[PDB]
């Protein structure tokens, strides 16, 4: 059974791991290859800070909440193990800030110690009058990919640099199953106008005294500050439809000004890095089987917008179940 | 008017600075010490604001300190001071009453069952948001501020108060930490020896303090700016200045048990120091040439320094009123 995973970002690699894990014993052989034209550190996943928090707008979709829940419990079970530094996985607490009161989120019990902010905490943020405090976790995108890559390498998964032009190209080389985890660029392989880039820009600064995340909300251009292992991510940029890869100077100014107003100690933080990425925005994730005419199936797993880390593991297990249902059939 | 402060730890320097700011409106101030940063006990402290669990005016000096620091935590100077917000955990075997300082800190609450599931050894505790004021940095900062203001510093081991009086000191501010007894007998002053190590573990974003009602030989993990402090050693009466293998093993085993991610972390260093333990901070006046005592702040020198600095400044003001 020759499987080809197209995509080496969090979705591609986690899906690959779940397939190997569930079906390596069952197939003789399970042969798994990953193709991609961008590998860490050049993927969209590498840009992500990796804070576990779904978006504010609840889609009222319990399958998706359950994928998110699953990912969180999965991560939590790793967080106090020897592995965890290697995943780039740790616990972090912090603030969500609003101008107006709004209802409690549906994930309020998934995270730890969720509560409303007190008056004296709100006094620390003069521009905001309502908010949340909780403890969640960060899974730093670059590190996780590195960790996933090692696990895949130990298991005999091979990696190839390739820009795939079509599914047929891969099918004609003998792939029995193609796993399509091509993120925001999925449209090049099969027309899909619901998939758009949600362009983002961030900067990484040296500010190791910042121990909390801070997220603000006005639709998604509002500053956030999210400490990682080594650096602090500053951002708050979201431009639907914009395909520019360049760091933009207005946006730079917008992140820096906005974040400094929020946390003036940042004024003296040294800027280490700056990056631009494209969130794979789709009103919902594409995750399904689709047969081609060649015998060759595709499993789509793409379109996770601004929450790919938050939800990836549930999606990976689902994709593996689809893979399993292909085995039952064929 | 001539003042000599003895001691260059947090207590001496903060007292010096707080007196100068409030009274220079014509002070000659000198600091004498035989140890300056990074070699004082203050340099060993992680700098977490938390008073002891045991429960007079000291609670206000602590609260004054927190409020003072909280109001500068976004200042331009905060990075130089070594000052930042930090949240974390206090872990206990059984229920205990909320501390007197619970509304001083930010967002005090009990731990929820799911939080407690992360720590198999403990069934109860707290979460709250406090602050860190890193001793190394804070001392560098105060030294710099004091130096702008004319305060002159001298490497000197003072042999007595009279020695200093005879050099024309009008007021001696005695901020000699655990060694105050070598200048005036004090049977109530003992060393509370502590040992720590510092590791490179910058994914640790929370403090974790445990309690065993031992006394205070219980593991604690306290992230700093650059490094993370591992500790949990309190030995009353022990005067050994050196690090010790038994204690290193207690710190390391106890903390890795508490946080197994620490197995990965590189040890940067390892220090020993002496908390100035006393039933009570000695903060008061005596005549020999006038002396103001400010010593015996145990394991809460950083936590309490500013209120003590203010009280010593009031004491300094009353001496002026009398001259
Ligand atoms: C600034 C910013 C911050 C973010 N922060 C967070 C966060 O805190 N938490 C969170 O959950 N999410 C966050 N995200 C979202 C997260 O980045 C994405 O949802 C996630 O990375 C999507 O992963 P993916 O594997 O689908 O895509 P990618 O990581 O982009 O991987 C796509 C892969 O497909 C390959 N590929 C594509 N087309 C082809 C082809 N034709 N041939 C071969 N290879 C191909 C690419 O080379 C790449 O390997 C953030 C995004 C941005 C932009
Ligand atoms: C391991 C450890 C961890 C700690 N963690 C914390 C914490 O997180 N938070 C907290 O609030 N507290 C903490 N403490 C306690 C805190 O460090 C002390 O309360 C504080 O440092 C006392 O400061 P000091 O200036 O009184 O003494 P020191 O810092 O010891 O300074 C004493 C000064 O007196 C000088 N001196 C003494 N005698 C003479 C003489 N005859 N002539 C000249 N100079 C003299 C010395 O050179 C020195 O400069 C900790 C202590 C230890 C040991
Ligand atoms: O509804 C929201 C909106 C944001 C947000 C706000 C401003 C700018 C961009 C995203 C948002 C940001 C974060 C921080 C991490 C993050 C940041 C991103 O830019 C992103 O696309 N995903 N995740 C979050 O965990 C939840 C979020 O939920
Ligand atoms: O009653 C206590 C006891 C401790 C404690 C625990 C173990 C070893 C030493 C002190 C303790 C420790 C800390 C952590 C910071 C600290 C750590 C010390 O070793 C110390 O001596 N003072 N302060 C605290 O904020 C409050 C504390 O209150
Ligand atoms: K427990």
Numbering used by the authors:
A (entry chain A): 1 to 218, 223 to 298, 302 to 337
B (entry chain B): 1 to 25, 29 to 58, 62 to 219, 222 to 296, 303 to 337
Pull text from the paper:
As hDAAO is a brain target relevant for schizophrenia, and because carboxylic acids generally restrict compounds from entering the brain, we sought to replace the compound 2 carboxylic acid with a bioisostere which could maintain the interaction with Arg283. After synthesizing and testing several analogues of compound 2, we discovered compound 3, in which the carboxylic acid moiety of compound 2 was replaced with a hydroxyl–pyridazinone group (structures in Table 1). The binding mode of compound 3 to the hDAAO:FAD holoenzyme was determined by X-ray crystallography. In this case, a higher resolution crystal form (P212121) was identified through sparse matrix screening and the structure resolved to 2.4 Å. The ketone and hydroxyl groups of compound 3 formed hydrogen bonds with Arg283, demonstrating that the hydroxyl–pyridazinone was an effective bioisosteric replacement of the carboxylic acid. The hydroxyl–pyridazinone substituent was stabilized in the hDAAO pocket by a total of five hydrogen bonds, two with Arg283, one with the Tyr228 hydroxyl, one with the Tyr55 hydroxyl, and one with the backbone carbonyl of Gly313. Indeed, compound 3, unlike compound 2, displayed the two modes of interaction with hDAAO discussed above: a hydrogen bond with Gly313 of hDAAO and a π–π stacking interaction with FAD. In the compound 3–hDAAO structure, amino acids 219–222 were not included in the refined structure because of a lack of defined electron density. However, we defined the compound 3–hDAAO structure as active-site lid open based upon two points of evidence: (1) The phenyl group of compound 3 overlaid with the phenyl group of compound 2 and would have sterically clashed with a closed active-site lid. (2) Movement of the Tyr224 backbone and side chain of hDAAO was nearly identical in both compounds 2 and 3–hDAAO structures, confirming that at least this portion of the lid moves away from the ligand. As compound 3 is a slightly larger molecule than compound 2, to accommodate this ligand, compound 3 had a ‘tilt’ through the subpocket of the active site.
